[PDB]
Design a protein around this nucleic acid. Structure first.
Ligand SMILES: [Mg+2]
Ligand SMILES: [Mg+2]
Ligand SMILES: [Mg+2]
Ligand SMILES: [Mg+2]
Ligand SMILES: [Mg+2]
Ligand SMILES: [Mg+2]
Ligand SMILES: [Mg+2]
Ligand SMILES: [Mg+2]
Ligand SMILES: [Mg+2]
Ligand SMILES: [Mg+2]
Ligand SMILES: [Mg+2]
Ligand SMILES: [Mg+2]
Ligand SMILES: [Mg+2]
Ligand SMILES: [Mg+2]
Ligand SMILES: [Mg+2]
Ligand SMILES: [Mg+2]
Ligand SMILES: [Mg+2]
Ligand SMILES: [Mg+2]
Ligand SMILES: [Mg+2]
Ligand SMILES: [Mg+2]
Ligand SMILES: [Mg+2]
Ligand SMILES: [Mg+2]
Ligand SMILES: [Mg+2]
Ligand SMILES: [Mg+2]
Ligand SMILES: [Mg+2]
Ligand SMILES: [Mg+2]
Ligand SMILES: [Mg+2]
Ligand SMILES: [Mg+2]
Ligand SMILES: [Mg+2]
Ligand SMILES: [Mg+2]
Ligand SMILES: [Mg+2]
Ligand SMILES: [Mg+2]
Ligand SMILES: [Mg+2]
Ligand SMILES: [Mg+2]
Ligand SMILES: [Mg+2]
Ligand SMILES: [Mg+2]
Ligand SMILES: [Mg+2]
Ligand SMILES: [Mg+2]
Ligand SMILES: [Mg+2]
Lengths: 136, 58, 94, 84
RNA sequence: CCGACUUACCAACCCGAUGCAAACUGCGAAUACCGGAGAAUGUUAUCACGGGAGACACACGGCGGGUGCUAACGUCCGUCGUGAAGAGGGAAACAACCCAGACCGCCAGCUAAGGUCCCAAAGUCAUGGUUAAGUGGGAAACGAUGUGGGAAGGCCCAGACAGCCAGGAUGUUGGCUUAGAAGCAGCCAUCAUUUAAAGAAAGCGUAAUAGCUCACUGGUCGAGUCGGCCUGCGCGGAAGA
RNA sequence: UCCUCCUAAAGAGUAACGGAGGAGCACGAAGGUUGGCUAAUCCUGGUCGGACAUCAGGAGGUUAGUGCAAUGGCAUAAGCC
RNA sequence: GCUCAACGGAUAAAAGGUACUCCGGGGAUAACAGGCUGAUACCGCCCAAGAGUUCAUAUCGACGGCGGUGUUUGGCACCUCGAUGUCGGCUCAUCACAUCCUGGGGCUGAAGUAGGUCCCAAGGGUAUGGCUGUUCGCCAUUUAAAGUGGUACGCGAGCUG
RNA sequence: UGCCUGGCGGCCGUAGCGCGGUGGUCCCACCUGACCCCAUGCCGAACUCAGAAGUGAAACGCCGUAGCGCCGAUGGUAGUGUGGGGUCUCCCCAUGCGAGAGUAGGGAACUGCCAGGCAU
């Protein structure tokens, strides 16, 4: 369960998920999972994908999480009316723009890394793709 | 003094207040109305602002 | 060793560059030395297959513009955020 | 119950807007005593023919034309007046 | 009496590479606003004073947001438009959407949005292409030798992809483990040999064997074939009184 | 009721039972003026003394300080004597 | 000289009950139903760690993801306060299919009997009582079966109360 | 007129750091002494006074050098005003404006008045 250890404030505005991404390159490993669509990744979603992806490669190589849930999401309880202040923080999410690399992988063959990212992307709401490192 | 002809081709019902004032400063009152205006950069700026709804012949 | 047939850009800007990429060419620049920088456009797909090699980004490339030779180096590349496309390429002479 | 009673917020407070900012900009012709900028602290410093009040209000000490400029080693923003 | 080392532990500060922020800023627009000058246009459209008001329940739509579930024909602000207080044409019907502001008359013409097979006014118009789903004329993740287009790649008259015939063999039942692990529960290795070829085996099978295919190879046939990438339009996913 | 920040869309202003915090004082010096002075933190060495007291040097440069919240400001200090 | 702090300060000086109630109003504003929405709920599907002696997908299915319906608990306050009678029962129904039985079929960890799970199918059929106002629920005994939901949680100018 | 130095500015990092070298005629700085003028929460450290033996060490000035700081295009991208579109949580098209970061590069300041010393 990825989550900031402490925060300056406990609630944040809804905001908008606009623009393209920063960090669209495979900077740490050799292979990567790149987000094609935009949306929200919950810490549970990110962690479930990480379990499948690290277990797929039989605990070999190295696994990098490139995204962090830093945006808290509040939800009003069931059967409460509108107003009476903002809701309580239920979970955390990261905002995802098209092109952002979500996971990186190294130390394993490309055919195995491709299969591992397939299982991992089965857990994510956003469309993904397989990318490799390139020399700029 | 290219003294160009300005015609209004579209209506000014739900236009911005700035666009309505630009038509009034150009001297256009209705669709199809044609006016005589001297060719100055000040006038060309007016035409550019409301170019979507006026046409120029010269 | 790679020969790149490129034609100098007639018009530049955001609208022109987006029109160019829709027509399957993409802009690039050649700067360096003392001559003024030259803005060229060139075919996306030919260079896309060419740059799949790792030696493209190190060895000396050839660019042909108006039948005249310019010796350049692939200084930088801007890629599309998710599609396998090249936004722009920075070339340095010699 | 049929409805669930809510809580209460604790953030309802705010203070009145103080109408700070620049009153006369560059090129304004001002009389003596005219307030140029109302400030918290000295974001703009007093230049020639410009005085600074107790709350750091910059005001004209002469009739003339307002001019903003950047001077000094610290690149601070000074307001002066060309007497006209 | 002050010492000098050491190891696979923890390791702050610092360095390099990465992201995030309404209550972060060493940067920073477009617009908006204020002021000065100039022309043109505008029935003074501007300000001041005075007589009379009404109104202070707003609504939807666009754009920028808070709240809510980026739920609501929800709620709360900014700004613009419309309705209110606005007819006419279009969106089947449909205050708020699109076009457009009705002084009156005409059995006159041109156009806007939107349209032109019939209802129902006007193209059964012209040229090129795509779809076979009545898609068009509701809906996603995901799935699939649907189909069109593009760039490249592997192999091929030294015989290529099917298919058919024949082989697919000796260390060897590799070792470890295990009640058994005999190519094929699981671990490490994955090497040698005769070869035209053959894997310490891709899969089926056995309690373990056995057995059956595949990879690969020789012949037979005698001309193209295989797999990804990008992309257009389709297909399934798709159940309500 | 009042103050500070955000919402607040780079002039002003701008709502919600929106997000966060404070005030109902204090000081005859903590005011005026003149003169003078410049921190936090860390390293090294040093009696009790150690992570951390006073001292010397160095680094560093406001990362401190402001009678009390927050923002803006402050070295010519608005900070200290 | 005013916590006149309800801080532009009604008076120097003031709390409650009303189902015994009453008047003027409002769908400007709640309870029933309709409407919008679909967080929740229900149904379906996607990926498969694992359970299943061995074997992911006979049967299930963790961590997660995407939809459908309008169907529960909700959210809103658009309609009705110059009245839309509100639960259950009785009588009479009618539709949808996400099928309870009967009919047809695929797979099975389907020997047969008997099942399990999907696909097709709405022609017909689809309990009686005990206890509680109950709908439900538990229980007794049947049945081939005792379906799920919509119809103002169908039906009071048809009855009950 | 050339160089060196001091003071007061312009300017506000292309100008500031670091590293290396270089200067004592004059100047500058260190420096000598201090009942004294004056001063230290003590202290002639600083401030002050009386002086010029020594020295350019530090500092300060100057010269050189990119390990930094800093400045920095062209092109592209983000955004965005106006108008129009879509598959409308977000985009796209026409047109106008057009960053930030980064890159190639630049870069060891330039300059004004006066006063002094050396040289002509
Ligand atoms: Mg554009
Ligand atoms: Mg608070
Ligand atoms: Mg009122
Ligand atoms: Mg009101
Ligand atoms: Mg309003
Ligand atoms: Mg509303
Ligand atoms: Mg109007
Ligand atoms: Mg009215
Ligand atoms: Mg109308
Ligand atoms: Mg009509
Ligand atoms: Mg006509
Ligand atoms: Mg006709
Ligand atoms: Mg035709
Ligand atoms: Mg259809
Ligand atoms: Mg076996
Ligand atoms: Mg489909
Ligand atoms: Mg403002
Ligand atoms: Mg603004
Ligand atoms: Mg009051
Ligand atoms: Mg009041
Ligand atoms: Mg009454
Ligand atoms: Mg009434
Ligand atoms: Mg109402
Ligand atoms: Mg209701
Ligand atoms: Mg309302
Ligand atoms: Mg109704
Ligand atoms: Mg009523
Ligand atoms: Mg009535
Ligand atoms: Mg069925
Ligand atoms: Mg029949
Ligand atoms: Mg009975
Ligand atoms: Mg029913
Ligand atoms: Mg009923
Ligand atoms: Mg009835
Ligand atoms: Mg009756
Ligand atoms: Mg009756
Ligand atoms: Mg540029
Ligand atoms: Mg720049
Ligand atoms: Mg730059």
């Amino acid at each position: 369960m990825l989550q900031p250890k402490r925060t300056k404030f406990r609630k944040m505005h809804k905001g908008r998920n606009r623009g393209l991404a920063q960090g669209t390159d495979v900077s740490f490993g050799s292979f990567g999972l790149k987000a094609v669509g935009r949306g929200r990744l919950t810490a549970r979603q990110i962690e479930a994908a990480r379990r499948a992806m690290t277990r797929a490669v039989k605990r070999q190589g190295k696994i990098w999480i490139r995204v962090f849930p830093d945006k808290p999401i509040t939800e009003k309880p069931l059967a409460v009316r509108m107003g009476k202040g903002k809701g309580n923080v239920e979970y955390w999410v990261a905002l995802i723009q098209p092109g952002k690399v979500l996971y990186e992988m190294d130390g394993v063959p490309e055919e195995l890394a491709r299969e591992a990212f397939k299982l991992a992307a089965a857990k994510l709401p956003i469309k993904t793709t397989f990318v490799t490192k390139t020399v700029m | 003094a290219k003294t160009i002809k300005i015609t209004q081709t579209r209506s000014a019902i739900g236009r911005l207040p700035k666009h309505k004032a630009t038509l009034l400063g150009l001297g256009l009152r209705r669709i199809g109305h044609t006016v005589e205006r001297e060719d100055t950069p000040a006038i060309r700026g007016m035409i550019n602002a409301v170019s979507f709804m006026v046409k120029v012949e010269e | 060793m790679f020969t790149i047939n490129a034609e100098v850009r007639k018009e530049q800007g955001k609208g022109a560059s987006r029109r160019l990429r829709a027509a399957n060419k993409f802009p690039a620049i050649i700067y360096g030395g003392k001559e003024a920088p030259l803005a060229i456009e060139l075919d996306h797909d030919k260079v896309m297959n060419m740059q799949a090699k790792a030696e493209f980004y190190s060895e000396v490339l050839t660019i042909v513009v108006d039948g005249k030779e310019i010796k350049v180096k692939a200084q930088d590349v801007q890629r599309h955020p998710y599609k396998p496309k090249l936004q722009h390429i920075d070339f340095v002479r010699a | 119950a049929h409805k669930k009673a809510g809580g209460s917020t604790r953030n309802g407070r705010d203070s009145e807007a103080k109408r700070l900012g620049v009153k006369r900009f560059g090129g304004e012709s001002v009389l003596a005593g005219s307030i140029i900028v109302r400030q918290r602290g000295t974001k703009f410093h007093a230049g020639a023919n410009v005085g600074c009040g107790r709350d750091h209000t910059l005001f004209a000490k002469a009739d003339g034309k307002v001019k903003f400029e950047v001077k000094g080693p610290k690149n601070r923003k000074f307001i002066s007046i060309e007497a006209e």
